[PDB]
Design an enzyme around this catalytic site. Sequence first.
Site, PDB file in Angstrom:
ATOM      1  N   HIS A  40      -3.560  -0.774   1.063  1.00 29.45           N
ATOM      2  CA  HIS A  40      -3.716  -1.972   0.251  1.00 29.45           C
ATOM      3  C   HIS A  40      -2.850  -3.096   0.761  1.00 29.45           C
ATOM      4  O   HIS A  40      -3.040  -4.238   0.357  1.00 29.45           O
ATOM      5  CB  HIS A  40      -3.532  -1.692  -1.259  1.00 29.45           C
ATOM      6  CG  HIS A  40      -2.104  -1.730  -1.737  1.00 29.45           C
ATOM      7  ND1 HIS A  40      -1.384  -0.603  -1.965  1.00 29.45           N
ATOM      8  CD2 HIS A  40      -1.278  -2.807  -2.071  1.00 29.45           C
ATOM      9  CE1 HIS A  40      -0.152  -0.942  -2.397  1.00 29.45           C
ATOM     10  NE2 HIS A  40      -0.084  -2.297  -2.454  1.00 29.45           N
ATOM     11  N   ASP A  84      -4.585   5.733   0.068  1.00 27.39           N
ATOM     12  CA  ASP A  84      -3.861   4.476   0.257  1.00 27.39           C
ATOM     13  C   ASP A  84      -2.817   4.603   1.388  1.00 27.39           C
ATOM     14  O   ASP A  84      -1.609   4.715   1.139  1.00 27.39           O
ATOM     15  CB  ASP A  84      -3.193   4.044  -1.054  1.00 27.39           C
ATOM     16  CG  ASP A  84      -2.710   2.605  -1.013  1.00 27.39           C
ATOM     17  OD1 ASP A  84      -3.041   1.878  -0.033  1.00 27.39           O
ATOM     18  OD2 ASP A  84      -2.013   2.193  -1.963  1.00 27.39           O
ATOM     19  N   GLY A 175       6.306  -5.595  -4.005  1.00 29.75           N
ATOM     20  CA  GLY A 175       7.091  -5.868  -2.795  1.00 29.75           C
ATOM     21  C   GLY A 175       7.613  -4.592  -2.142  1.00 29.75           C
ATOM     22  O   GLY A 175       7.911  -4.575  -0.938  1.00 29.75           O
ATOM     23  N   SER A 177       5.655  -1.892  -2.130  1.00 30.33           N
ATOM     24  CA  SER A 177       4.429  -1.224  -1.685  1.00 30.33           C
ATOM     25  C   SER A 177       4.469  -0.958  -0.196  1.00 30.33           C
ATOM     26  O   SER A 177       4.967  -1.795   0.560  1.00 30.33           O
ATOM     27  CB  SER A 177       3.223  -2.104  -1.953  1.00 30.33           C
ATOM     28  OG  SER A 177       2.769  -1.883  -3.277  1.00 30.33           O
ATOM     29  N   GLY A 178       3.961   0.208   0.195  1.00 26.47           N
ATOM     30  CA  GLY A 178       3.872   0.592   1.599  1.00 26.47           C
ATOM     31  C   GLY A 178       5.125   1.272   2.101  1.00 26.47           C
ATOM     32  O   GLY A 178       5.097   1.922   3.135  1.00 26.47           O
TER      33      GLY A 178
HETATM   34  C1  LIG Z   1       3.183  -2.796  -4.311  1.00 26.66           C
HETATM   35  O1  LIG Z   1       4.216  -3.445  -4.163  1.00 26.66           O
HETATM   36  C2  LIG Z   1       2.295  -2.901  -5.533  1.00 26.66           C
HETATM   37  C3  LIG Z   1       3.140  -2.722  -6.786  1.00 26.66           C
HETATM   38  C4  LIG Z   1       3.136  -1.268  -7.154  1.00 26.66           C
HETATM   39  C5  LIG Z   1       4.477  -0.699  -6.838  1.00 26.66           C
HETATM   40  C6  LIG Z   1       4.633   0.629  -7.530  1.00 26.66           C
HETATM   41  N1  LIG Z   1       4.716   0.449  -8.982  1.00 26.66           N
HETATM   42  C7  LIG Z   1       5.486   1.200  -9.770  1.00 26.66           C
HETATM   43  N2  LIG Z   1       6.245   2.150  -9.233  1.00 26.66           N
HETATM   44  N3  LIG Z   1       5.506   1.006 -11.084  1.00 26.66           N
END
Ligand SMILES: *C(=O)CCCCCNC(=N)N
Length: 223
Positions: A40, A84, A175, A177-178
């Site tokens: 994503h 993902d 931020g 993510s990944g």
């Molecule tokens: C990526 O940065 C999209 C935001 C999801 C991050 C993970 N979320 C969470 N642990 N609540």
Amino acid sequence: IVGGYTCGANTVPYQVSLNSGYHFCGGSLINSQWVVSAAHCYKSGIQVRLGEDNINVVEGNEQFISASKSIVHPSYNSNTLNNDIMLIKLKSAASLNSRVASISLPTSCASAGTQCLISGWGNTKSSGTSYPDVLKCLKAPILSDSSCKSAYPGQITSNMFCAGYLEGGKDSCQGDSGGPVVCSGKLQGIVSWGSGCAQKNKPGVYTKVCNYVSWIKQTIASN
Ligand SMILES: *C(=O)CCCCCNC(=N)N
Ligand SMILES: CCOC(=O)c1ccc(O)cc1
Ligand SMILES: [Ca+2]
């Protein structure tokens, strides 16, 4: 990362920042020429930034390298976030040193209750928005399959796991993510999704990297 702590400069030497004129996602260095991130997070014009601590200041030890290829899993589904995972090939090999190092892939999956390290430059607030200059870290356990399914009914595939805290206050966030979930020196997870950040009963959801070791090796071998 919400409710974490400052890692310390270069203490997570496999952590990378994906930059398109700004930091947008994290990733993990798995060998001198390949990075693992979330599908994503895909876009064109990715620059990989290695050896970072303060992502807003040139401090020394940084290497900026353009991606030559970004390979999203062919079965990535943008609505469910199943599969993902993305591999990024660097235009040239990173030079490896104490501050820029690869992280090993897992040989087996990790069990519920395994403690892991999650790191990133994401939002540090559950309420509102605050982005750190320096890398943040969080220690978090992997949850049971039943807890994960209770938290997110009908949304957890076999390629996902939950980790974190049901009481709220400690989580990965936008931020992050990944970025890496590392458990006893193995990359077991990739920051993927969740409902808000650090909300009670809503833990983080992570791509289960152990399901993709063969695909990673085959894709690297053929590119
Ligand atoms: C990526 O940065 C999209 C935001 C999801 C991050 C993970 N979320 C969470 N642990 N609540
Ligand atoms: C069924 C998959 O879960 C979602 O609908 C979902 C997708 C992305 C996201 O950021 C949160 C939830
Ligand atoms: Ca820097």
